Short mmCIF file of C-alpha atoms (C1' of nucleotides) in Angstrom, two decimals:
data_model
loop_
_atom_site.label_atom_id
_atom_site.label_comp_id
_atom_site.label_asym_id
_atom_site.label_seq_id
_atom_site.Cartn_x
_atom_site.Cartn_y
_atom_site.Cartn_z
CA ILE A 1 19.54 17.38 -15.54
CA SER A 2 19.85 14.61 -18.17
CA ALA A 3 21.91 11.39 -17.87
CA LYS A 4 24.02 12.37 -20.86
CA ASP A 5 24.87 15.78 -19.36
CA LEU A 6 25.95 14.25 -16.03
CA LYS A 7 27.97 11.56 -17.82
CA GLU A 8 29.78 14.23 -19.81
CA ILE A 9 30.31 16.41 -16.76
CA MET A 10 31.76 13.53 -14.71
CA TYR A 11 33.93 12.59 -17.69
CA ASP A 12 35.53 15.98 -18.01
CA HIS A 13 37.01 15.35 -14.57
CA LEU A 14 38.40 11.88 -15.27
CA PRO A 15 41.91 11.14 -16.56
CA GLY A 16 42.40 8.74 -19.44
CA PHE A 17 39.60 6.98 -21.29
CA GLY A 18 37.72 3.71 -20.88
CA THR A 19 38.92 3.23 -17.31
CA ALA A 20 36.92 1.42 -14.60
CA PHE A 21 35.76 4.81 -13.44
CA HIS A 22 34.34 5.73 -16.84
CA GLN A 23 32.41 2.50 -16.73
CA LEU A 24 31.29 3.43 -13.27
CA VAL A 25 30.15 6.80 -14.58
CA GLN A 26 28.04 4.98 -17.11
CA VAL A 27 26.57 2.65 -14.52
CA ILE A 28 25.90 5.43 -12.03
CA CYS A 29 24.17 7.62 -14.59
CA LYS A 30 22.19 4.70 -15.99
CA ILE A 31 20.83 3.56 -12.65
CA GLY A 32 20.44 7.14 -11.44
CA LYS A 33 18.29 8.06 -14.46
CA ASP A 34 16.29 4.84 -13.96
CA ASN A 35 15.11 6.02 -10.50
CA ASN A 36 15.15 9.78 -10.86
CA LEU A 37 18.22 10.44 -8.78
CA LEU A 38 20.34 12.29 -11.31
CA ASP A 39 19.70 15.50 -9.38
CA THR A 40 20.90 14.19 -6.01
CA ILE A 41 23.98 12.46 -7.56
CA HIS A 42 24.89 15.72 -9.34
CA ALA A 43 24.65 17.51 -6.01
CA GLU A 44 26.87 14.97 -4.28
CA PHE A 45 29.51 14.97 -7.05
CA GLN A 46 29.61 18.77 -6.77
CA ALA A 47 29.81 18.71 -3.02
CA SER A 48 32.60 16.10 -3.00
CA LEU A 49 34.65 18.00 -5.54
CA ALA A 50 34.17 21.29 -3.63
CA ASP A 51 35.32 19.47 -0.46
CA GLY A 52 38.66 18.74 -2.19
CA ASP A 53 37.79 15.09 -2.96
CA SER A 54 39.26 13.60 -6.13
CA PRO A 55 36.61 12.78 -8.75
CA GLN A 56 37.29 9.04 -8.41
CA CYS A 57 36.83 9.40 -4.68
CA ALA A 58 33.62 11.37 -5.33
CA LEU A 59 32.20 8.61 -7.57
CA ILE A 60 32.95 6.06 -4.90
CA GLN A 61 31.18 8.25 -2.35
CA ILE A 62 28.16 8.32 -4.60
CA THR A 63 28.18 4.49 -4.58
CA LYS A 64 28.30 4.52 -0.76
CA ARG A 65 26.01 7.45 0.19
CA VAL A 66 23.28 7.30 -2.49
CA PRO A 67 20.72 4.72 -1.28
CA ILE A 68 19.90 3.17 -4.65
CA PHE A 69 23.48 1.91 -4.94
CA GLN A 70 23.02 -0.23 -1.83
CA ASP A 71 20.07 -2.17 -3.19
CA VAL A 72 20.79 -2.77 -6.88
CA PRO A 73 23.14 -5.51 -8.09
CA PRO A 74 25.97 -4.49 -10.40
CA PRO A 75 24.31 -4.29 -13.80
CA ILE A 76 24.86 -7.15 -16.28
CA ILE A 77 26.11 -6.04 -19.68
CA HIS A 78 26.09 -8.59 -22.45
CA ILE A 79 29.13 -8.59 -24.69
CA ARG A 80 30.78 -10.58 -27.42
CA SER A 81 34.46 -11.10 -26.50
CA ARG A 82 36.75 -10.15 -23.63
CA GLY A 83 38.42 -7.79 -26.15
CA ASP A 84 35.26 -5.68 -26.28
CA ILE A 85 36.12 -4.47 -22.80
CA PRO A 86 38.41 -1.39 -22.92
CA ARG A 87 42.08 -2.04 -22.14
CA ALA A 88 42.15 0.14 -18.99
CA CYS A 89 39.57 -2.28 -17.57
CA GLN A 90 41.33 -5.52 -18.59
CA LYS A 91 43.58 -5.89 -15.54
CA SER A 92 40.61 -5.07 -13.34
CA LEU A 93 38.49 -8.08 -14.36
CA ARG A 94 37.88 -10.99 -11.96
CA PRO A 95 35.47 -13.92 -11.28
CA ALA A 96 32.22 -12.77 -9.66
CA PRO A 97 31.51 -13.68 -6.01
CA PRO A 98 28.01 -14.80 -4.93
CA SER A 99 26.74 -11.32 -4.20
CA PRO A 100 28.91 -8.64 -5.83
CA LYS A 101 28.06 -5.23 -4.35
CA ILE A 102 28.39 -1.83 -6.08
CA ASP A 103 29.45 -0.10 -2.87
CA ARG A 104 32.24 -2.66 -2.43
CA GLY A 105 33.76 -1.84 -5.83
CA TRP A 106 31.76 -3.96 -8.30
CA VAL A 107 31.04 -1.66 -11.23
CA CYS A 108 29.34 -4.21 -13.45
CA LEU A 109 29.34 -7.87 -14.54
CA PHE A 110 30.41 -8.59 -18.07
CA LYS A 111 28.44 -11.64 -19.25
CA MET A 112 29.90 -12.99 -22.43
CA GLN A 113 27.72 -14.94 -24.94
CA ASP A 114 29.81 -18.12 -24.55
CA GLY A 115 28.77 -18.27 -20.91
CA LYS A 116 31.79 -16.66 -19.27
CA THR A 117 31.39 -13.92 -16.67
CA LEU A 118 33.92 -11.36 -15.50
CA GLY A 119 33.22 -8.69 -12.92
CA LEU A 120 34.75 -5.20 -13.08
CA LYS A 121 36.22 -4.50 -9.67
CA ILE A 122 37.67 -1.25 -8.34
CA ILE B 1 -9.01 -7.74 15.81
CA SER B 2 -6.22 -5.23 16.68
CA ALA B 3 -4.03 -3.42 14.16
CA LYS B 4 -0.97 -5.25 15.46
CA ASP B 5 -2.50 -8.71 15.24
CA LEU B 6 -3.65 -7.97 11.74
CA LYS B 7 -0.24 -6.56 10.83
CA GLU B 8 1.48 -9.70 12.16
CA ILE B 9 -0.98 -12.06 10.50
CA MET B 10 -0.40 -10.38 7.14
CA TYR B 11 3.41 -10.28 7.56
CA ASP B 12 3.41 -13.95 8.43
CA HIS B 13 2.10 -14.74 4.96
CA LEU B 14 4.41 -12.48 3.00
CA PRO B 15 7.76 -13.31 1.38
CA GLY B 16 10.75 -10.98 1.82
CA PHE B 17 11.13 -7.99 4.13
CA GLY B 18 10.53 -4.30 3.67
CA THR B 19 8.76 -5.00 0.37
CA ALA B 20 6.09 -2.86 -1.23
CA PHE B 21 3.54 -5.24 0.15
CA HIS B 22 4.77 -4.85 3.73
CA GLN B 23 4.36 -1.12 3.35
CA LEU B 24 0.94 -1.74 1.87
CA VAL B 25 0.07 -3.77 4.97
CA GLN B 26 1.12 -0.71 6.98
CA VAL B 27 -1.19 1.55 4.99
CA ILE B 28 -4.14 -0.88 5.01
CA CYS B 29 -3.89 -1.39 8.77
CA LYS B 30 -3.53 2.33 9.45
CA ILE B 31 -6.65 3.19 7.48
CA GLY B 32 -8.60 0.24 8.80
CA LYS B 33 -7.70 1.10 12.43
CA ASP B 34 -8.59 4.71 11.80
CA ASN B 35 -12.12 3.92 10.73
CA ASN B 36 -12.84 0.66 12.60
CA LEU B 37 -12.94 -1.47 9.50
CA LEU B 38 -10.29 -3.93 10.65
CA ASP B 39 -12.75 -6.77 10.96
CA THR B 40 -13.93 -6.26 7.38
CA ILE B 41 -10.38 -6.02 6.05
CA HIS B 42 -9.51 -9.24 7.89
CA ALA B 43 -12.56 -11.03 6.52
CA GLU B 44 -11.57 -10.05 3.01
CA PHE B 45 -7.97 -11.14 3.48
CA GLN B 46 -8.95 -14.63 4.48
CA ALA B 47 -11.74 -14.84 1.88
CA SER B 48 -9.09 -14.11 -0.74
CA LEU B 49 -6.79 -16.72 0.77
CA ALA B 50 -9.79 -19.08 0.53
CA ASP B 51 -10.09 -18.18 -3.20
CA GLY B 52 -6.50 -19.36 -3.73
CA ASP B 53 -5.10 -15.83 -3.99
CA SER B 54 -1.48 -15.13 -3.10
CA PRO B 55 -1.10 -12.99 0.05
CA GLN B 56 -0.03 -10.14 -2.25
CA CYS B 57 -3.09 -10.60 -4.41
CA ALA B 58 -5.20 -10.72 -1.27
CA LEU B 59 -3.89 -7.37 -0.01
CA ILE B 60 -4.72 -5.92 -3.41
CA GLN B 61 -8.17 -7.50 -3.16
CA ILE B 62 -8.56 -5.55 0.07
CA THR B 63 -7.86 -2.33 -1.78
CA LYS B 64 -10.30 -3.25 -4.57
CA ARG B 65 -13.22 -4.76 -2.64
CA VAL B 66 -13.31 -2.68 0.52
CA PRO B 67 -14.90 0.63 -0.54
CA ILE B 68 -12.95 3.15 1.64
CA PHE B 69 -9.73 2.53 -0.28
CA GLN B 70 -11.53 4.17 -3.16
CA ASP B 71 -12.05 7.34 -1.19
CA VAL B 72 -8.81 8.06 0.62
CA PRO B 73 -5.70 9.20 -1.18
CA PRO B 74 -2.42 7.32 -0.82
CA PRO B 75 -1.05 8.72 2.44
CA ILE B 76 1.89 11.11 2.35
CA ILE B 77 4.75 9.93 4.55
CA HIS B 78 7.33 12.54 5.35
CA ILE B 79 10.88 11.23 5.61
CA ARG B 80 14.35 12.76 5.97
CA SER B 81 16.29 10.81 3.43
CA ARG B 82 15.34 8.31 0.71
CA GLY B 83 17.46 5.84 2.65
CA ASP B 84 14.66 5.57 5.22
CA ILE B 85 12.72 3.65 2.57
CA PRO B 86 13.41 -0.11 2.83
CA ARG B 87 15.70 -1.66 0.25
CA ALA B 88 13.00 -3.86 -1.29
CA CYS B 89 10.87 -0.76 -1.86
CA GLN B 90 13.56 1.19 -3.73
CA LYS B 91 12.85 -0.28 -7.21
CA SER B 92 9.12 0.48 -6.82
CA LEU B 93 9.43 4.21 -6.37
CA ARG B 94 8.30 6.41 -9.23
CA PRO B 95 6.92 9.89 -9.96
CA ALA B 96 3.28 10.29 -8.92
CA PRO B 97 0.49 10.71 -11.48
CA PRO B 98 -1.92 13.64 -10.94
CA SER B 99 -4.44 11.69 -8.82
CA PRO B 100 -2.84 8.41 -7.78
CA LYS B 101 -5.20 5.88 -6.24
CA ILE B 102 -4.63 3.17 -3.72
CA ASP B 103 -6.94 0.81 -5.60
CA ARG B 104 -4.73 1.27 -8.68
CA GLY B 105 -1.56 0.26 -6.94
CA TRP B 106 -0.38 3.48 -5.35
CA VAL B 107 0.50 2.45 -1.81
CA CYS B 108 1.73 5.78 -0.48
CA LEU B 109 3.64 8.98 -1.31
CA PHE B 110 7.14 9.59 0.08
CA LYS B 111 7.80 13.26 0.67
CA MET B 112 11.50 14.01 1.10
CA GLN B 113 12.78 17.08 2.85
CA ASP B 114 14.73 18.08 -0.22
CA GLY B 115 11.48 18.61 -2.09
CA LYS B 116 11.37 15.33 -4.03
CA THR B 117 8.17 13.27 -4.04
CA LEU B 118 8.00 9.64 -5.18
CA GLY B 119 5.03 7.29 -5.14
CA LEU B 120 5.26 3.67 -4.20
CA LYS B 121 3.63 1.67 -6.98
CA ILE B 122 2.86 -2.06 -7.15
CA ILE C 1 13.07 -23.79 -14.70
CA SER C 2 12.54 -20.33 -13.24
CA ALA C 3 13.15 -19.43 -9.59
CA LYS C 4 9.50 -18.51 -9.11
CA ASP C 5 8.33 -21.85 -10.46
CA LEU C 6 10.74 -23.72 -8.29
CA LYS C 7 9.72 -21.58 -5.35
CA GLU C 8 6.04 -22.44 -5.86
CA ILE C 9 6.85 -26.14 -6.32
CA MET C 10 8.76 -26.22 -3.06
CA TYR C 11 6.10 -24.20 -1.26
CA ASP C 12 3.35 -26.52 -2.44
CA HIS C 13 5.03 -29.27 -0.40
CA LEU C 14 5.52 -27.13 2.75
CA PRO C 15 2.99 -27.00 5.61
CA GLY C 16 2.12 -23.73 7.38
CA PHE C 17 3.37 -20.30 6.32
CA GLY C 18 6.39 -18.20 7.24
CA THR C 19 8.29 -21.13 8.77
CA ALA C 20 12.06 -21.46 8.75
CA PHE C 21 11.69 -23.81 5.79
CA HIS C 22 9.79 -21.14 3.80
CA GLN C 23 12.63 -18.72 4.32
CA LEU C 24 15.09 -21.46 3.47
CA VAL C 25 13.20 -22.09 0.24
CA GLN C 26 13.60 -18.39 -0.48
CA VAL C 27 17.38 -18.57 0.24
CA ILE C 28 17.93 -21.73 -1.81
CA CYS C 29 16.06 -20.31 -4.84
CA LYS C 30 17.77 -16.91 -4.52
CA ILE C 31 21.29 -18.32 -4.54
CA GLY C 32 20.46 -21.06 -7.03
CA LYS C 33 19.13 -18.40 -9.38
CA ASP C 34 22.27 -16.31 -8.76
CA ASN C 35 24.30 -19.05 -10.41
CA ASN C 36 22.01 -21.22 -12.64
CA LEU C 37 21.85 -24.15 -10.25
CA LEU C 38 18.08 -24.01 -10.45
CA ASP C 39 18.07 -27.07 -12.71
CA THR C 40 20.36 -28.92 -10.33
CA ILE C 41 18.37 -27.94 -7.27
CA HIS C 42 15.12 -28.98 -9.00
CA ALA C 43 16.58 -32.35 -9.97
CA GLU C 44 17.81 -32.91 -6.42
CA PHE C 45 14.49 -31.95 -4.84
CA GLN C 46 12.59 -34.22 -7.17
CA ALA C 47 14.94 -37.19 -6.79
CA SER C 48 14.69 -36.88 -3.04
CA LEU C 49 10.89 -36.76 -3.08
CA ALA C 50 10.80 -39.84 -5.33
CA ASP C 51 13.08 -41.68 -2.91
CA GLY C 52 10.48 -41.00 -0.21
CA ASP C 53 12.16 -38.17 1.69
CA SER C 54 9.97 -35.46 3.27
CA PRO C 55 10.28 -32.16 1.36
CA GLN C 56 11.91 -30.67 4.46
CA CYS C 57 14.52 -33.43 4.34
CA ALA C 58 14.99 -32.70 0.63
CA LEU C 59 15.61 -29.00 1.30
CA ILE C 60 18.23 -29.82 3.92
CA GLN C 61 19.89 -32.36 1.69
CA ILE C 62 20.05 -29.61 -0.86
CA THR C 63 22.01 -27.36 1.45
CA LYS C 64 24.35 -30.31 2.08
CA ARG C 65 24.76 -31.81 -1.38
CA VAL C 66 24.75 -28.87 -3.79
CA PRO C 67 28.24 -27.33 -3.73
CA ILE C 68 27.15 -23.68 -4.01
CA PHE C 69 25.69 -23.87 -0.48
CA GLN C 70 29.05 -24.88 0.84
CA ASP C 71 30.86 -21.93 -0.84
CA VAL C 72 28.37 -19.16 -0.03
CA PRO C 73 27.70 -17.74 3.48
CA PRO C 74 24.19 -17.29 4.88
CA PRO C 75 22.76 -14.13 3.25
CA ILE C 76 22.42 -10.98 5.36
CA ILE C 77 18.96 -9.43 5.41
CA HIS C 78 18.37 -5.93 6.73
CA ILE C 79 15.22 -5.44 8.76
CA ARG C 80 13.98 -2.86 11.29
CA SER C 81 12.69 -4.91 14.26
CA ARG C 82 12.70 -8.54 15.39
CA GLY C 83 8.95 -8.29 15.16
CA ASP C 84 9.31 -8.18 11.40
CA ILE C 85 10.37 -11.79 11.33
CA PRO C 86 7.37 -14.13 10.87
CA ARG C 87 5.99 -15.82 13.97
CA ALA C 88 6.88 -19.42 13.01
CA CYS C 89 10.53 -18.31 12.65
CA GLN C 90 10.67 -16.63 16.08
CA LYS C 91 11.68 -19.63 18.22
CA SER C 92 14.37 -20.48 15.74
CA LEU C 93 16.32 -17.21 16.15
CA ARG C 94 19.70 -17.07 17.88
CA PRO C 95 23.04 -15.17 18.24
CA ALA C 96 25.29 -15.78 15.23
CA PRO C 97 28.68 -17.57 15.54
CA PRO C 98 31.84 -16.26 13.77
CA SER C 99 31.47 -18.44 10.69
CA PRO C 100 27.89 -19.68 10.28
CA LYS C 101 27.49 -22.31 7.57
CA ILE C 102 24.46 -22.86 5.37
CA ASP C 103 25.06 -26.61 5.40
CA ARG C 104 24.93 -26.47 9.21
CA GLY C 105 21.43 -25.10 9.35
CA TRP C 106 22.09 -21.36 9.13
CA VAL C 107 19.46 -20.04 6.72
CA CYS C 108 20.10 -16.35 6.84
CA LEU C 109 21.46 -13.57 9.05
CA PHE C 110 19.14 -10.82 10.12
CA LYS C 111 20.90 -7.49 10.47
CA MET C 112 18.93 -5.04 12.56
CA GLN C 113 19.29 -1.26 12.51
CA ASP C 114 20.24 -1.46 16.20
CA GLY C 115 23.48 -3.20 15.25
CA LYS C 116 22.38 -6.47 16.79
CA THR C 117 22.44 -9.64 14.66
CA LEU C 118 20.21 -12.71 14.74
CA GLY C 119 20.59 -15.88 12.72
CA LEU C 120 17.80 -18.21 11.61
CA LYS C 121 18.91 -21.75 12.52
CA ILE C 122 17.24 -25.04 11.51
CA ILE D 1 -7.38 23.57 10.53
CA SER D 2 -7.66 21.34 13.59
CA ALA D 3 -10.69 19.26 14.49
CA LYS D 4 -11.57 21.46 17.45
CA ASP D 5 -11.62 24.73 15.54
CA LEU D 6 -13.72 23.26 12.80
CA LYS D 7 -15.97 21.71 15.44
CA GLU D 8 -16.54 25.19 16.83
CA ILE D 9 -16.99 26.82 13.42
CA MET D 10 -19.73 24.21 12.85
CA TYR D 11 -21.21 24.75 16.33
CA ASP D 12 -21.42 28.53 16.05
CA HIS D 13 -24.06 28.05 13.35
CA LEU D 14 -26.23 25.63 15.34
CA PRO D 15 -29.27 26.36 17.57
CA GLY D 16 -30.00 24.60 20.85
CA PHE D 17 -27.78 22.21 22.76
CA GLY D 18 -27.03 18.51 22.48
CA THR D 19 -28.89 18.23 19.19
CA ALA D 20 -28.45 15.46 16.64
CA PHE D 21 -26.48 17.97 14.57
CA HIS D 22 -24.01 18.80 17.33
CA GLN D 23 -23.43 15.09 17.55
CA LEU D 24 -23.09 14.94 13.75
CA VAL D 25 -20.52 17.77 14.00
CA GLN D 26 -18.59 15.50 16.36
CA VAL D 27 -18.85 12.50 13.98
CA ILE D 28 -17.76 14.50 10.94
CA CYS D 29 -14.88 16.14 12.73
CA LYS D 30 -13.71 12.80 14.09
CA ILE D 31 -13.77 11.11 10.68
CA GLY D 32 -12.18 14.03 8.88
CA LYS D 33 -9.53 14.14 11.58
CA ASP D 34 -8.85 10.45 11.20
CA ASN D 35 -8.33 10.63 7.44
CA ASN D 36 -6.97 14.15 7.17
CA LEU D 37 -9.89 15.54 5.25
CA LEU D 38 -10.64 18.48 7.54
CA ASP D 39 -9.57 20.95 4.84
CA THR D 40 -11.86 19.57 2.12
CA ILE D 41 -14.74 19.03 4.53
CA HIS D 42 -14.30 22.63 5.62
CA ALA D 43 -14.26 23.75 2.00
CA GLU D 44 -17.55 21.95 1.40
CA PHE D 45 -19.07 23.48 4.59
CA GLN D 46 -18.50 26.97 3.25
CA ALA D 47 -19.44 26.09 -0.32
CA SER D 48 -22.78 25.00 1.17
CA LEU D 49 -23.01 28.25 3.22
CA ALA D 50 -22.31 30.14 -0.03
CA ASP D 51 -25.26 28.34 -1.62
CA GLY D 52 -27.54 29.71 1.09
CA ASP D 53 -28.05 26.32 2.69
CA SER D 54 -28.90 26.17 6.40
CA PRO D 55 -25.88 25.05 8.48
CA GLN D 56 -27.68 21.83 9.35
CA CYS D 57 -28.31 21.38 5.68
CA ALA D 58 -24.67 22.24 5.02
CA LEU D 59 -23.49 19.43 7.30
CA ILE D 60 -25.83 17.02 5.53
CA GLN D 61 -24.26 18.24 2.26
CA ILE D 62 -20.95 17.12 3.71
CA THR D 63 -22.38 13.66 4.31
CA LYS D 64 -23.68 13.63 0.70
CA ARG D 65 -20.75 15.14 -1.21
CA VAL D 66 -17.51 13.94 0.42
CA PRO D 67 -17.33 10.22 -0.49
CA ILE D 68 -15.85 8.70 2.67
CA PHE D 69 -19.16 9.14 4.56
CA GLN D 70 -20.67 6.46 2.33
CA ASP D 71 -18.06 3.99 3.49
CA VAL D 72 -17.38 4.38 7.22
CA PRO D 73 -20.06 3.11 9.60
CA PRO D 74 -21.81 5.34 12.12
CA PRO D 75 -19.58 5.36 15.20
CA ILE D 76 -20.54 3.30 18.21
CA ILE D 77 -20.81 5.32 21.37
CA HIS D 78 -20.90 3.33 24.55
CA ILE D 79 -23.32 4.49 27.22
CA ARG D 80 -24.78 3.37 30.45
CA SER D 81 -28.53 4.39 30.20
CA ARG D 82 -30.76 5.92 27.48
CA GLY D 83 -30.90 8.93 29.80
CA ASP D 84 -27.22 9.56 29.13
CA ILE D 85 -28.12 10.78 25.67
CA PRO D 86 -28.77 14.56 25.49
CA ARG D 87 -32.50 15.41 25.46
CA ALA D 88 -32.51 17.21 22.08
CA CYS D 89 -31.35 13.87 20.61
CA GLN D 90 -34.05 11.72 22.30
CA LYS D 91 -36.66 12.30 19.63
CA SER D 92 -34.36 11.06 16.89
CA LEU D 93 -33.47 7.65 18.33
CA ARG D 94 -34.80 4.51 16.65
CA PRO D 95 -33.75 0.84 15.92
CA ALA D 96 -30.75 0.46 13.65
CA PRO D 97 -30.84 -1.46 10.32
CA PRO D 98 -28.16 -4.09 9.57
CA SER D 99 -25.92 -1.56 7.77
CA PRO D 100 -26.95 2.00 8.68
CA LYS D 101 -25.12 4.59 6.59
CA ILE D 102 -24.07 8.12 7.49
CA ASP D 103 -25.17 9.62 4.18
CA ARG D 104 -28.64 8.32 4.87
CA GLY D 105 -29.14 10.15 8.13
CA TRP D 106 -27.52 7.74 10.59
CA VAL D 107 -25.24 9.92 12.75
CA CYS D 108 -24.11 7.31 15.28
CA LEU D 109 -25.09 4.26 17.30
CA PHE D 110 -25.76 4.54 21.03
CA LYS D 111 -24.64 1.27 22.61
CA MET D 112 -25.85 0.36 26.08
CA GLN D 113 -23.61 -1.81 28.23
CA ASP D 114 -26.53 -4.28 28.66
CA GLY D 115 -26.14 -4.88 24.91
CA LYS D 116 -29.23 -3.00 23.64
CA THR D 117 -28.49 -0.47 20.86
CA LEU D 118 -30.25 2.67 19.51
CA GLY D 119 -29.34 4.58 16.40
CA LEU D 120 -29.48 8.34 16.11
CA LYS D 121 -31.22 9.29 12.86
CA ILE D 122 -31.69 12.74 11.33
"C1'" C E 1 3.02 -10.20 -6.70
"C1'" U E 2 0.31 -12.21 -10.75
"C1'" A E 3 -2.31 -12.27 -15.64
"C1'" G E 4 -3.48 -10.09 -20.42
"C1'" A E 5 -2.40 -6.82 -24.67
"C1'" C E 6 1.40 -4.08 -27.04
"C1'" G E 7 6.55 -2.12 -27.91
"C1'" U E 8 12.22 -2.72 -27.69
"C1'" C E 9 18.22 -5.92 -28.41
"C1'" G F 1 16.60 -14.60 -22.08
"C1'" A F 2 16.63 -8.76 -20.68
"C1'" C F 3 13.90 -4.34 -20.63
"C1'" G F 4 9.43 -0.74 -21.46
"C1'" U F 5 4.23 0.92 -21.64
"C1'" C F 6 -0.88 0.31 -20.93
"C1'" U F 7 -4.81 -2.60 -18.64
"C1'" A F 8 -6.81 -5.95 -15.00
"C1'" G F 9 -7.03 -8.94 -10.33
"C1'" C G 1 -62.01 21.57 -1.89
"C1'" U G 2 -59.08 24.44 1.56
"C1'" A G 3 -56.22 24.63 6.08
"C1'" G G 4 -53.80 22.67 10.49
"C1'" A G 5 -51.44 17.81 12.42
"C1'" C G 6 -49.41 12.65 12.66
"C1'" G G 7 -47.26 8.42 10.30
"C1'" U G 8 -44.55 6.05 6.05
"C1'" C G 9 -41.07 6.73 2.07
"C1'" U G 10 -37.78 9.61 -1.11
"C1'" A G 11 -34.32 13.69 -1.64
"C1'" G G 12 -30.92 17.80 -0.30
"C1'" C H 1 -33.02 21.08 9.94
"C1'" U H 2 -35.59 21.70 4.98
"C1'" A H 3 -38.24 20.09 0.50
"C1'" G H 4 -41.10 16.61 -2.31
"C1'" A H 5 -44.49 12.02 -2.84
"C1'" C H 6 -48.14 8.98 -0.46
"C1'" G H 7 -51.57 7.69 3.30
"C1'" U H 8 -54.44 9.07 7.76
"C1'" C H 9 -57.08 11.93 11.10
"C1'" U H 10 -59.37 16.52 12.85
"C1'" A H 11 -61.88 21.09 11.60
"C1'" G H 12 -64.47 24.57 8.46
#
RNA sequence: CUAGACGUC
RNA sequence: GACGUCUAG
RNA sequence: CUAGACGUCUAG
RNA sequence: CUAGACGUCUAG
C-alpha cells in the first residue's frame, strides 16, 4: 500500500476538511511511509473501525499502539503565516511544551519563518 | 575477558541508551564469545580509543579490522513486535539489501512474527 | 553553535567516561537544542571557565542560571535493566521524589520496563 | 540439522577411531554450531562427496571453502597428560606456530595443565 | 557516530 | 537550516 | 635409470 | 587422508 492511498482511505472516513485529524492523517502516513509501516497502520485502522471505533479514535489508537509514534517527535512543518493553517485547526493551536509527544495529542509543530512556533494539539 | 565485562566496558563509553551501537555491542560480544575472540576484540577497541576514535568509531573498527565479521552474516533476531526494538534503534531500521554485511554497517536483522524483516543499519 | 559541537567542547573538559556529568552534558545539550539556548549555554560555560570555575561547577551553574532548566523536568529515559546505566553513574542512582528538579541535581529519570524508577542525582 | 546428526553423518564416512579427522569433525561441528553454519557446511560436505572426494578430503574442503575457518583459531582442549589424546592422533602432534590456522591443517591445540601445549596437524 | 562526493525546499 | 542517495572509517 | 622408504615444503 | 615439488637413504 502507498502513503497516498492510505491518506485517501483515512480521509473518506473523516468529517469536514482541514481538521486536526486530517493533519494527523498526513503526519501518520508521512512517518509511516518513512519507516515502512504503512501496512501495519492500515491493518490497525481497519481493525479499529471493525471493532466499532470511530475513525478519530482509530487514528489516536495508531498514535498509541504503533511503536514508531512513541519515538518520533511531532514533525516540524515550516510555514509562512498563521493563516496558512486551516481554520478547523486554528482554535487547536498552542505554545509547545519542552517535549511534545505524538501519543499525547501533538500532531505537529508549526514553525513560522518569523520565529514563532505553535503546536497542533488534539 | 568475559562477554559481560566487555559489554559493560563498551557500554560505559557510549552515549544514549538502546542505540544502534548498543545493539552492535551485543552482536560483537555474542560473536566474539562464540569463537573465543573476545581478547582480540578488546585489544582492537582500546587500540582505536588510543587512535582518538570515538567509541562508536571503535566498534566499527572492530567490524572492519577483525576478520570474522567479514564471514558471518548479520544475525537474525526473532521478535514478537517491533516495539521490542529500543526507541533509539527505531529510526535506523530499514529493508535489508540482498547480502547485508556487518562490516558495511548492518548490525542485525529483525524478523517479526508478522513476516516483516528490517535490518539495523548504522 | 551546534549541539554536537557543544557536547564535544563540554566533554573535552570532563574526566573519565560515563559519569553523571557526562549524562548531564547530554541532558543540557538536548534541552538547550530543543529551544535554541545552545548559544546561551555556550556563553555561560565559557564565562564560567574564564572566571576559573571547574567545568563541573560550570555545568551545575548552568542548571541553576539558565531559566529553561527551571521550567523543564528531568527527562525520562526508558531502559531495560539497571545494568544498562554506566558504571560511574551507578552509585549516584536513587528513588525519585514527587517533583524532582533539574536545578536540584536531578539529571534524568530512568524508567525501567519493570515499572520501577531510578533518578540520577548529582 | 543439529550438530550431533551432522557429526554422525561425518563419522559414518570415517575409518578407525579417535583419528585426527574425528577430532576435526568435532571442531567443524562446534564452530558451525556456534555461528549457525551447519546447513552450509553440510551442503559443502555433500558437494565434495558429489565430486568424488574422500570424506577426509571433503572435510578438508570444508576448511578450505567456507571462509570462517580462516578466521577462528584452532580450539584449545585442556588435558591432563599426552596419553589422554587418542592413539590414532598421536602421530599427528607437533609444536604449534604463533598463529596456527585451521585451513592449514591445524585441527586443535592440546593444552596440558602443566602449561605445555601440542598442536594436532593433518 | 563521523568524514567525503552528489541530489532536493 | 531540513531532508535524500552513494562511498569510506 | 627404475622401484620401495623417510624427512622438508606446497596444494586439495 | 590424497596429490605435487625438493632433498636423502636403501636395493637392483
